[PDB]
Design a protein around this ligand. Structure first.
Ligand code: HEM
Ligand code: HEM
Lengths: 145, 145
């Protein structure tokens, strides 16, 4: 259950998620676009899903991609703010899960985001521990897909 | 143009939007659900659009409505954060405009949100000036619909 998965976020995982978010979340435009262009660079098979955004190679210059990337960073901002209350975390997670289910995105495919997160965090000197905490949050979303 | 409308947000309007957001945005769950239940109470003709959320009369207890309301408050959080840069404000606005165009929501209907905003702001002792500033931001989104 998304509920059980959500419950797996211990005080230590929450602390790591918050501390790292202080840095990655402080530049939603830059880090959001980085997460996206890295997703496309390492998983080219996912590009076809983002047909609405036009030419994603354009990176930052592509307004649709930029508008999408900033908005995504707020979904994460939403999750981070709901950590202390699993009931609210679960409903926001389920709301976004529906956005992906309607696009035929499976739990396995959604998990491809773990690669980019590991790199973005790395470029900010946050090691494996942080990458692992972020995988646990992504796992709560996967429990809903 | 959404661009022109966005340009209409002067230093004074931005200040009022930020100051009032300090209070309304500090309780996204509560104020978000208030904006929604007030929208449904004063504009019953809009309820049919929210079929996915189930029984909206359930208010806070309805997780789908709660998940939707918190997420909406982040869209506004997104707009407020992009005020200083019209280029980023325009792309996030256009991203959300598409979410409404696909649901057949016209600029006039989207404007119905001005009523609820005026009330939510009022219950926090923010008068007409603030309600007017918020109408100008809602106007930027309307320029895109
Ligand atoms: C940290 C992880 C992720 C978050 C928080 C996230 C967040 C979002 C958000 C907020 C939207 C917009 C929803 C809407 O307005 O309809 C969205 C759409 C979408 N996401 Fe994700 N997403 C993530 C990872 C992924 C992954 C791994 C895939 C790739 C297989 C994916 C595929 C999609 C698709 C296809 C769309 C539609 C794009 C469009 O046409 O606008 N997402 N996502
Ligand atoms: C302050 C104003 C508003 C904001 C920022 C806003 C924001 C949002 C957001 C973020 C979504 C979710 C997008 C998605 O992932 O599908 C959404 C969906 C939607 N909005 Fe709005 N909205 C606003 C006002 C309105 C108004 C006035 C109407 C009513 C006529 C409306 C109708 C809809 C509909 C029909 C949906 C789909 C609900 C669902 O099936 O989940 N919105 N809105």
């Amino acid at each position: 259950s998304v509920y059980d998965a959500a419950a797996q976020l211990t005080a230590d995982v929450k602390k790591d998620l918050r501390d790292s978010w202080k840095v990655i979340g402080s530049d939603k435009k830059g880090n959001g676009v980085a997460l996206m262009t890295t997703l496309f660079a390492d998983n080219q098979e996912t590009i076809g899903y983002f047909k609405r955004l036009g030419n994603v190679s354009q990176g930052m210059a592509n307004d649709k991609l930029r508008g999408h990337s900033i908005t995504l960073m707020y979904a994460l901002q939403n999750f981070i703010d709901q950590l202390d209350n699993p009931d609210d975390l679960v409903c926001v997670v389920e709301k976004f899960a529906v956005n992906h289910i309607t696009r035929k995105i499976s739990a396995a495919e959604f998990g491809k985001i773990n690669g980019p997160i590991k790199k973005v965090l790395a470029s900010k000197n946050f090691g494996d521990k942080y990458a692992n905490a972020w995988a646990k949050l992504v796992a709560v979303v996967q429990a809903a897909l």
